[PDB]
């Protein structure tokens, strides 16, 4: 059967009984840093069972006329376990992830989600002169919602969150060039994505630079007849892979 | 004192030239290369991925996510029409802005086949068959199911495998076709009709939606790189 997976990382395990395939990045599996491309000159810390495991983020409700969500994945993990304690005592660090969005419904519901993973998603502000503040770009493991109307220019520092432009200025239909999967409630129940380290420097700081973005956008909205269960939640389960850090200092 | 003789074309600045030129920083040392994932070697790798097509514009949906969804009901008659658009991937406003039309509008000629993947985004107990036709030009639009069955078609049954792929072939007199609208090199029409109904059980919603994707086959090609009309400037930024 091509419909069952079993992923094992560290001391955790994800079981699935109704899935699609597994989309692997840009054809690349995450590996450690080689000796050709390294630029730092002291021995890195590789915990590799303390950090590489499945951290489960918070749940969000899929309402009947909803818009979308985004987590800012690089430091979505910042307050989770021993991934968030090496992120502070160190200066550098590289990672790759294994994102597993899971949302289930019966055989009488209908809908469709798009689960992308957008590297370097620079967001636009509502007021044209300013740039959005930190609290509006990323919430610490809490989803930030899109809006099916548009945000006016009276708001000084807020992200422009119209869904049909995806907040970056591009069309929302063309987001299928990034590695992506659909959660069609007719056939699918979850979506797996294995992302390598995509950046222009061999190691980057973990608090000033969010090098991904995970967006869930419902292209076909939820619907059900009167009687079915109206609360359909969505859970994201992110796990780092082949994590290493460098340059120890005080706590920040 | 070698005798030379300067031809026409001397001391001109052509923007698409290929010459050498003295370096402004001698004996520089570049920063060594790194294996960043996801390298583009050719622009026809970008125009061979699927992108969602706004088949449902109608002036109220283009400022929404409703523009991508094609509405499909449960009817009381047979042979109705679901959608229809002409196959002009550079000038028709349906395929104007997808990932294929944003690349063809940099070039002038194009040649090849085009895939069209539909996906039934409905309930798990809804059934039905659709006919996906494509009629080459010469006559008008097909207006019946009898007039559209005579072209190129494929009858799609909705089951466990949700999606079905209509592959529009390359039938043309010339070796290329213009990106801009021209009636000398028109390409045809793509329609879609109910074969049978959409039959649902009790307590299942009847209004189901259908998405549509577009891409290019392994023999698509472009020519004569030009400028794009989808951008505009007044002063500097």
């Amino acid at each position, epitope marked *: 059967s091509d419909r069952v997976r079993s992923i094992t990382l560290g001391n955790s395990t994800i079981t699935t009984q109704e899935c699609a395939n597994v989309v692997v990045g840009y054809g690349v599996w995450p590996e450690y840093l080689k000796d050709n491309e390294a630029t730092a000159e002291d021995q890195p810390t590789q915990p590799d069972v303390a950090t590489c495991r499945f951290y489960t983020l918070e749940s969000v409700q899929w309402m009947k*006329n909803s818009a979308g969500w985004w987590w800012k994945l690089p430091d979505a993990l910042s307050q989770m376990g021993l991934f968030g304690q090496n992120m502070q005592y160190h200066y550098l660090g590289r990672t790759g992830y294994t994102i597993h969005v899971q949302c289930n419904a019966s055989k009488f519901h209908q809908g469709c989600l798009l689960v992308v993973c957008v590297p370097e998603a620079e967001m636009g502000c509502s007021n044209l002169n300013n740039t959005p503040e930190f609290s509006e770009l990323s919430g610490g493991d809490s989803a930030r919602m899109f*809006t*099916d109307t548009q945000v*006016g220019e*009276s708001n000084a520092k807020k992200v422009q969150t119209a869904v049909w432009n995806a907040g970056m200025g591009v069309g929302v239909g063309n987001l299928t060039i990034f590695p992506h999967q659909w959660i069609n409630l007719r056939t699918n129940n979850s979506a797996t994505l294995v992302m390598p380290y995509i950046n222009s420097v061999p190691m980057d700081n973990m608090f000033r630079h969010n090098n991904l973005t995970l967006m869930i956008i419902p292209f076909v909205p939820l619907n059900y007849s009167e009687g079915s269960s109206p609360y359909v939640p969505i859970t994201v389960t992110i796990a780092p892979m082949c994590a290493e850090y460098n340059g120890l200092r005080l706590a920040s | 004192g070698l005798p030379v003789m300067t031809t026409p074309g001397s001391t001109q600045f052509l923007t698409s030239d290929d010459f050498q030129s003295p370096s402004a920083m001698p004996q520089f040392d570049v920063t060594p290369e790194m294996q960043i994932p996801g390298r583009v070697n050719n622009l026809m790798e970008i125009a061979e991925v699927d992108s969602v097509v706004p088949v449902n514009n109608t002036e*109220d*949906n283009v400022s929404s996510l409703k523009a991508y969804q094609i509405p499909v009901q449960s009817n009381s008659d047979n042979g109705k029409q679901v959608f229809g658009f002409p196959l002009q991937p550079g000038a028709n406003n349906v395929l104007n802005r997808t990932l294929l039309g944003e690349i063809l509008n940099y070039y002038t000629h194009w040649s090849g086949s085009i895939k069209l993947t539909f996906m039934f985004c409905g309930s798990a107990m809804a059934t039905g068959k659709f006919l996906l036709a494509y009629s080459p030009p010469g006559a008008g639009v097909p207006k019946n199911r009898k007039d559209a069955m005579l072209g190129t078609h494929v009858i799609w049954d909705v089951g466990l495998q949700s999606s079905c792929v209509l592959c529009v072939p390359w039938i043309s007199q010339t070796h290329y076709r213009y990106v801009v609208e021209d009636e000398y090199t028109a390409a045809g029409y793509v329609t879609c009709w109910y074969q049978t109904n959409i039959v649902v059980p009790a307590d299942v919603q009847s209004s189901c939606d259908i998405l549509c994707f577009v891409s290019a086959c392994n023999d698509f090609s472009v020519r004569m790189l030009k400028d794009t009309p989808f951008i505009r400037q007044d002063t500097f930024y």
Partner: antibody, heavy 124, light 107 residues
Framework: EVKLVESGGGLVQPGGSLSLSCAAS????????MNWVRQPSGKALEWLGF??????????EYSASVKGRFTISRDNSQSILYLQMNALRAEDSATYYC????????????????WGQGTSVTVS | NVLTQSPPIMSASPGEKVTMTCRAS???????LHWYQQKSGASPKLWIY???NLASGVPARFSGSGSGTSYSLTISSVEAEDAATYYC?????????FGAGTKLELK
């Protein structure tokens, strides 16, 4: 049937505050956008701001002239909607309405279908 | 974006066909222009949404049209029931501006 009754208007001094309240009945309060429109005596209608539904996150969006002085919010338990007015001037004497919005197709056209009866504020 | 309605006051006898307008300074989308009717001393009411679609319970005599920056409302037969003031609404950017008003005076 939709039934919107608002209350809380009256005489007030310039430089003072006043809180209007609009109560909703007949529909689910967490599904629809809720607007606030005022109208001076025999003049044009003026839009003050709305407050989005639960699925878009209850954010607000004010006008250009009342931004920072007025505040739109609701109560968590029962179906009611507020408006807190601050630093009132002489031109704020008008009739204040409480309008509803809805989705017509699947999208959101910006109409205001069901209106309230209108409360009055006189500032002098 | 300021809406300008013309005429400010108008008069028509029952049985006539009368047409008012609402012209914007910049182009609005056709799905964002709406028409309202406020009678004398009462709360307003939605009349036409998205420039050609009739609201609920409205008579079939009213019909709006137009596109671009010129929009219009057309009454085929005037009765004594529709003597009121008609506003037009828009949206191109925030805020949503209402029109001045066209008062229908019965003859």
């Amino acid at each position: 049937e939709v039934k919107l009754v608002e209350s809380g208007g009256g005489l007030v001094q310039p430089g003072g505050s006043l809180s209007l309240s609009c109560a909703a009945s007949g529909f689910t309060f967490t599904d629809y956008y809720m607007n606030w429109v005022r109208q001076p005596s025999g003049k044009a209608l003026e839009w003050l701001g709305f407050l989005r539904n639960k699925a878009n996150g209850y954010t607000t969006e004010y006008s250009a002239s009342v931004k920072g002085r007025f505040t739109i919010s609701r109560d968590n338990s029962q179906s009611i909607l507020y408006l807190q007015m601050n630093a009132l001037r002489a031109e704020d004497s008008a009739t204040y309405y409480c309008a509803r919005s809805r989705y017509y197709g699947g999208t959101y056209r910006y109409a205001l279908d069901y209106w309230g009866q209108g409360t009055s504020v006189t500032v002098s | 974006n300021v809406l300008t309605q013309s005429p400010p006051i108008m008069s028509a006898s029952p049985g006539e066909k009368v047409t008012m307008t609402c012209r914007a300074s910049s182009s609005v989308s056709s799905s964002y222009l709406h028409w309202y009717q406020q009678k004398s001393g009462a709360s307003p009411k939605l009349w036409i949404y998205s420039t050609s679609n009739l609201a609920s319970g409205v008579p079939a005599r009213f019909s709006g049209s137009g596109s671009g920056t010129s929009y219009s409302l057309t009454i085929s037969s005037v009765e004594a029931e529709d003597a009121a003031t008609y506003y037009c609404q828009q949206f191109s950017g925030y805020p949503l501006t209402f029109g001045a008003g066209t008062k229908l005076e019965l003859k």
